[PDB]
Amino acid sequence: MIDFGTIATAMVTPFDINGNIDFAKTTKLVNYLIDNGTTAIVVGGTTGESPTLTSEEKVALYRHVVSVVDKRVPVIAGTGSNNTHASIDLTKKATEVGVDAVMLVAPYYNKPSQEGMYQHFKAIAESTPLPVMLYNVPGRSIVQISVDTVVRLSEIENIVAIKDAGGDVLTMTEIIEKTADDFAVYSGDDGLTLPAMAVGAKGIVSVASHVIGNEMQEMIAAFQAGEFKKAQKLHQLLVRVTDSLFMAPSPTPVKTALQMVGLDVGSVRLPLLPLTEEERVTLQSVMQSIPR
Amino acid sequence: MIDFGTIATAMVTPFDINGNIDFAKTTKLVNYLIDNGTTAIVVGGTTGESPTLTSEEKVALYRHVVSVVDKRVPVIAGTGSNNTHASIDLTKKATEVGVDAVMLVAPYYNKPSQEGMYQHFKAIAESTPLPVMLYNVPGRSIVQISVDTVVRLSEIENIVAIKDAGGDVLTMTEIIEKTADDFAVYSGDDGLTLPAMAVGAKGIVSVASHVIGNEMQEMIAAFQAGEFKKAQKLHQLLVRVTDSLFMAPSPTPVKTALQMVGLDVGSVRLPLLPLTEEERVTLQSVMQSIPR
Amino acid sequence: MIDFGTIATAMVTPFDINGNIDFAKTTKLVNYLIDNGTTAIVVGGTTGESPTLTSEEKVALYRHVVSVVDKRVPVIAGTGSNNTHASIDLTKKATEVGVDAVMLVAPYYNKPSQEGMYQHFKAIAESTPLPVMLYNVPGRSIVQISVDTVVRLSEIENIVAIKDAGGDVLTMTEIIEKTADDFAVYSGDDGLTLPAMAVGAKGIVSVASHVIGNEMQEMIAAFQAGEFKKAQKLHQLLVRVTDSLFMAPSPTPVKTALQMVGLDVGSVRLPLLPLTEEERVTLQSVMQSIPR
Amino acid sequence: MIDFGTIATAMVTPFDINGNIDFAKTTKLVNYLIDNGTTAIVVGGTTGESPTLTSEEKVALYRHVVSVVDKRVPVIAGTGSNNTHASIDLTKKATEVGVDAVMLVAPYYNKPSQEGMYQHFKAIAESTPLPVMLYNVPGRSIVQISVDTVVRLSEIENIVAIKDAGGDVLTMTEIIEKTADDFAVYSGDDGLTLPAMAVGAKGIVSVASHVIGNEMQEMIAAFQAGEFKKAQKLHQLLVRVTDSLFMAPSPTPVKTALQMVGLDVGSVRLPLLPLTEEERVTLQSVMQSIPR
Ligand SMILES: [K+]
Ligand SMILES: [K+]
Ligand SMILES: [K+]
Ligand SMILES: [K+]
Ligand SMILES: [K+]
Ligand SMILES: [K+]
Ligand SMILES: [K+]
Ligand SMILES: [K+]
Ligand SMILES: [K+]
Ligand SMILES: [K+]
């Protein structure tokens, strides 16, 4: 059974001066993340600007990240879209470049039913030998993957985990309860890392871990240790930093924050825009205020 | 200035037994719609299963529809996606096969800002000489195109209309109020056709027109002639029929309904599924209620 | 059958400098409304600050308004609360003072079921021979009176109308459709007056009628005569003025706007507060922009 | 500083066969709760059917509960309504019969502003020497007490705690962080007890404690000890049991569940109704699944 650990990072996709994938910067980022508390990498997900990457770009990115990582942590590719046939095709291509797992989001835009999603996820999982992590995100796809649908899917051999960004730890609770011990529930919301783990989440699929991954591992350890005050103080930092990263559409703030701390990863592709000057000043003040 | 008329139909994409585009069934559907009150055709939009069509399929479909239509009504291509660069590419390709206008939806999944959407739509609109219709649909894209953003976009020469599927006639009111006379607001919700036209909407971008186009035409003629009683009775039918078409994910019910009235357009692509027998019989009862 | 006409006004309760009911100012307000397009008066409703009036003050207000109105327009008393027994008591008292009907709100705070609300409204309607208007207001009570529940209640002889502030003209449509001709549906949102009447609503229960009652009747007459450009212009005005009246908690804005047009009706009781200076400037600009 | 402990209970109000307060059943219930993990009693709150109790009933109920409790745990009276003047009156009356604190809910129905609520709570608190617990319940009152408003109120000497039923452990996090050590945040939802405590909440104001108080006590002891496996096991039970208690309008399910385990506390007052036989069977099957 594959182990993504406590912090899977939803990695940004660095771009060069012309807006193309910057593989040199990607190498720097991957090595930084692994040395700063990242236990698995999600490549080409939402935070990696999957919507504006071509299929060819996605596969080149998956391949480069796999190569650099060199089996140090699991690499999860965001191959799932709202098109089942296309999702199968991309999943096959990611498998061919040696990723360890795939992330499959609830189809966005077309608003599928519970059974539609079941057949969607079932069809993609059957097409690959790789482990599958589901991704519930009604904040982006509108639909929810119901507890019962998640449970049914968990009975499929290679569907091993879920990123639950539904913002609701009570639905998380029920998923945790009604699925087997070898099915893992991750938070998809940085701010909920602590309370999600309190109810049985294995960890977090993170955006904030780009800049405070060490602090996050420290919080998780402290909680697991029973050091509630220590964990709570770091939780307060995590909430504050997370919030500053979502005042403009992600991933634009986290890319700018990385640049502020000496890891330039370029800008973003339309329809996303760079930060305004006012937005930048606000973010920098937050970044400067992180205890060092 | 292009005139889309009172009923633009969000056309389904007919498929054969194996899910491929059925060009012969498409020919029959196009002729049927034009003979049943459709004044413009939207090709390859949400109702046309845009998420599961490839770019090459879309273009092949636009080309075919252009041929069959033979300039009888305007042909609007659903070229907008959540990727600006890709949207410019597909818009160019549609222009080259002789479509008359393009539909650009608010980017789904990546949750752009108002300014992001402004630059997105501006970039696409400047890439083509064709008229552009905006498409507001928060129920699928999460984001709303704000009234102010729409007003700004209306000042761009070839941005001439908006399909507002926000379900709110008061926001439509304000758009109608704050834009020039040569900028048209369409309802994107069949049920709201009558009340939207009461506050100044030009017409409807319709799904229900696949099965009650003539009744809708009659209702609009009644309202425009001040015959409010006559319109209200047809309005009650339209609301009833429309609701029955969205009890399962669209466009599956309207495709099933078309088969019931002798126009087979096949089924749907995953992640969408055929109606269950329970769903079919529920739909059939409402279809049967249409006065003949 | 009782006829509330096209504009029932949710009348504010004038208070003197000590926060007590001002009887002279109430008389002035009543005569003003009757001379400015009001066809029925709702006394002691939400807009009349029912929550902060004592039981004794409510009945005194009912008494005074009945005596001043002198059968010129119907007087509707807001006797319903979230307590059925109390609602019966207050309804009987209002009946004895000689009001013409009672308004019964969906119970707030305690979140009753559909069947609970059915029994609530049935028990109150039972206690009086007077006509009863239901008041659906999920924006204050959270719960909705379902279409099916309204239809059942409409079958009770003296339940003759509903004020629907659900903000949904399509649920209104269904109520209009499924109830008898002698059961009236009123909009409970000033902005929706035009679109609601377009789908068969009899009129509006209004707040904006305190300040633009003539313009509202002008709009309704223009619509009914098929003068759509005129109606749409007045509609745009109604929407804009209405919105300005709800930027701070009602009824505080409309009380201030009355004073701006020379009807001082005093201030409000806690937990409501006077408008801030910023708020007063904002409202004043909207009020002085009304074309008269 | 008053200490409400980890499990305050929102006590139901027992009624006799005529729907009047049953004082003997109240005595039985109070003693039961105290022997089953309850550390503070909230009297005459929402769960105690405050909307349908007269002021005279409330005061008699407070007085009796004060008598039976005999200083073993704090008695908190639900004196706050949506009328500030009335809330001061009832607060005085509760103070006079010897309660230990009062609970003040966000005004429902009239939708006050943040500053309105600030002045409301400030004025009531000023009127009594007793400690005050605020009650945030947007699910019943619509409005929220913002974090900022809660922080400002926490600076008032006798405002010492908040029951937060907003359902959001991240707003709780911020309140906890920004208020002094002597200001306590309680979850207002049973299911959130564990995740709320994980971020620094003192405890829960509970409904489920009527039936599984001992289980919740063991859950909290396990959690505070850092035995998360057992805490998570009991958390799962708490969530399950709690959900079943809100499938019909509370408090009707918890009263019925109490009757099912031999503590008959009677029925409910209109607009609330007894459970149907179907609702009763559904509740019974969940209650019967509680381990004994
Ligand atoms: K599995
Ligand atoms: K599990
Ligand atoms: K234009
Ligand atoms: K216009
Ligand atoms: K205009
Ligand atoms: K009736
Ligand atoms: K009717
Ligand atoms: K009817
Ligand atoms: K304090
Ligand atoms: K604190």
What is the domain count for chain A? 1
Collect residues with CB below 5 Å from ion ligand 6.
C 159
Ranges of beta strands (E only) in chain B are: 7-10, 40-43, 75-77, 101-105, 132-136, 159-164, 184-187, 203-206
> Taking a C-beta distance cutoff of 8 angstroms, is the pair C56, C24 a contact?
no
Contacting residues of A for B140, CB less than 8 Å apart: 109-111, 142
Which helix (H) or strand (E) segment holds residue B153: the answer is: helix B147-154
Q: Distance between CA atoms of C209 and C261, rounded to whole angstroms?
A: 13
Category of B130 on φ-ψ map: left (φ > 0), alpha (ψ -120 to 50) or beta: beta
Amino acid at residue number B147: V
Residues sharing a CB contact under 8 Å with residue C59, sequence separation 6 or more, in sequence order: C90, C93, C94, C97
Amino acid at residue number A263: L
Which helix (H) or strand (E) segment holds residue C260: the answer is: helix C252-260
Q: Does B176 touch chain C if contact means CB atoms closer than 8 Å?
A: yes
A272 contacts B109? CB cut-off 8 A: no
Contacting residues of A for D221, CB less than 8 Å apart: none
Angle between helices B209-224 and B252-260 (to 10 degrees): 90
Torsion of CA D219, D223, D224, D226, to 10 degrees: 140
A272 contacts B119? CB cut-off 8 A: no
Residues sharing a CB contact under 8 Å with residue A73, sequence separation 6 or more, in sequence order: A5, A34, A38, A39, A40, A41
Experimental method used, please? X-ray
Q: Does B139 touch chain A if contact means CB atoms closer than 8 Å?
A: yes
Reported resolution in A? 1.9
Token look-up 């009763």 returns D280
Task: Considering every ligand atom shown, identify the ligand nearest to the alpha carbon of residue A178 and give its number.
Answer: 2
Token look-up 């509707």 returns C76
Q: Does A52 touch chain B if contact means CB atoms closer than 8 Å?
A: yes
Task: Identify which of C21, C4, C283, C20 has the alpha carbon closest to the alpha carbon of residue C161.
Answer: C4
Domain that includes residue A177, residue range:
1-292
- A199, A235, A239 member nearest D232 (Cβ): A199
Residues sharing a CB contact under 8 Å with residue C19, sequence separation 6 or more, in sequence order: C266, C267, C269
Say how many Å lie between the CA of residue A165 and the centre of ligand 3: 39
Q: Which residues pair with A185 in a beta bridge?
A: A162
Residue of D nearest to A175 (CA): D236
Q: Does D197 touch chain C if contact means CB atoms closer than 8 Å?
A: no
Amino acid at residue number C104: L
> Taking a C-beta distance cutoff of 8 angstroms, is the pair C1, C39 a contact?
no
- What tokens does D227 get? 């035995």
Q: Distance between CA atoms of C113 and B145, rounded to whole angstroms?
A: 36
B195 contacts C199? CB cut-off 8 A: yes
The H-assigned helical ranges of chain A are 23-35, 55-69, 84-96, 114-126, 138-141, 147-154, 169-178, 193-198, 209-225, 228-244, 252-260, 277-288
Torsion of CA A175, A180, A181, A182, to 10 degrees: -100
Q: In the structure, how many helices (H) and strands (E) does chain D have?
A: 12, 8
Q: Does D196 touch chain A if contact means CB atoms closer than 8 Å?
A: yes
- What tokens does D30 get? 């109070």
Q: Distance between CA atoms of A136 and A104, rounded to whole angstroms?
A: 9
Say how many CA atoms lie within 13 Å of D225 toward its Cβ: 12
- What tokens does A21 get? 């994938």
| Residues within 8 A of D (CB atoms), A 156-175 only | 169-170, 173-174
Helix (H, G, I), strand (E, B) or coil at D205: strand
D248 contacts C82? CB cut-off 8 A: no
Q: Distance between CA atoms of A119 and A108, rounded to whole angstroms?
A: 15
> Taking a C-beta distance cutoff of 8 angstroms, is the pair B191, B212 a contact?
no
Q: Distance between CA atoms of D268 and D255, rounded to whole angstroms?
A: 8
Q: Distance between CA atoms of B215 and B233, rounded to whole angstroms?
A: 10
Residues sharing a CB contact under 8 Å with residue C91, sequence separation 6 or more, in sequence order: C77, C79, C80, C102, C124, C127, C128, C130
Peptide bond into B271 cis (omega under 30): yes
- Give, in order, the Cα–Cα distances in Å from B110 to each of A81, A137, A253: 13, 12, 14
Interchain CB contacts (distance < 8 Å): A and B: 111
Question: How distant is the alpha carbon of residue C241 from its chain centre?
Answer: 17
Helix (H, G, I), strand (E, B) or coil at C210: helix
> Taking a C-beta distance cutoff of 8 angstroms, is the pair C209, C29 a contact?
no
Q: Distance between CA atoms of A187 and A196, rounded to whole angstroms?
A: 6
Say how many Å lie between the CA of residue B84 and the centre of ligand 3: 20
Burial class of C262 by CB neighbour count within 10 A (0 to 12, 13 to 18, 19+):
exposed
Q: Does C214 touch chain D if contact means CB atoms closer than 8 Å?
A: no
Q: Please give the positions of A annotated as active site.
A: 135, 163
B198 contacts C194? CB cut-off 8 A: yes
C79 is in an annotated binding site: no
> Taking a C-beta distance cutoff of 8 angstroms, is the pair B64, B30 a contact?
no
- What tokens does D7 get? 């499990």
Residues sharing a CB contact under 8 Å with residue B46, sequence separation 6 or more, in sequence order: A109, A110, B10, B78, B105, B137, B140, B250
Residue of B nearest to C199 (CA): B232
A236 contacts D173? CB cut-off 8 A: yes
Which helix (H) or strand (E) segment holds residue D40: the answer is: strand D40-43
Query: Considering B62, B118, B135, B186, which one is annotated as catalytic?
Result: B135
Contacting residues of A for B110, CB less than 8 Å apart: 46, 49, 51-52, 140, 249, 271-272
> Taking a C-beta distance cutoff of 8 angstroms, is the pair A2, A160 a contact?
yes
The yes-or-no answer on residue C135 being catalytic is: yes
Amino acid at residue number D231: A
CATH number for the domain spanning A20: value is: 3.20.20.70
Chains B and C are in contact, defined as 3 or more C-beta pairs closer than 8 angstroms? yes
DSSP 8-class letter at A276: P
Amino acid at residue number C11: M
- B46, B107, B139 member nearest A271 (Cβ): B107
> Taking a C-beta distance cutoff of 8 angstroms, is the pair C7, C38 a contact?
yes
Say how many CA atoms lie within 13 Å of D129 toward its Cβ: 3
Query: Residue positions of D in the annotated binding site for pyruvate?
Result: 47, 205
Ranges of beta strands (E only) in chain C are: 7-10, 40-43, 75-78, 101-105, 132-136, 159-164, 184-187, 203-206
Q: Distance between CA atoms of B140 and B143, rounded to whole angstroms?
A: 8
Q: Distance between CA atoms of A221 and A228, rounded to whole angstroms?
A: 10
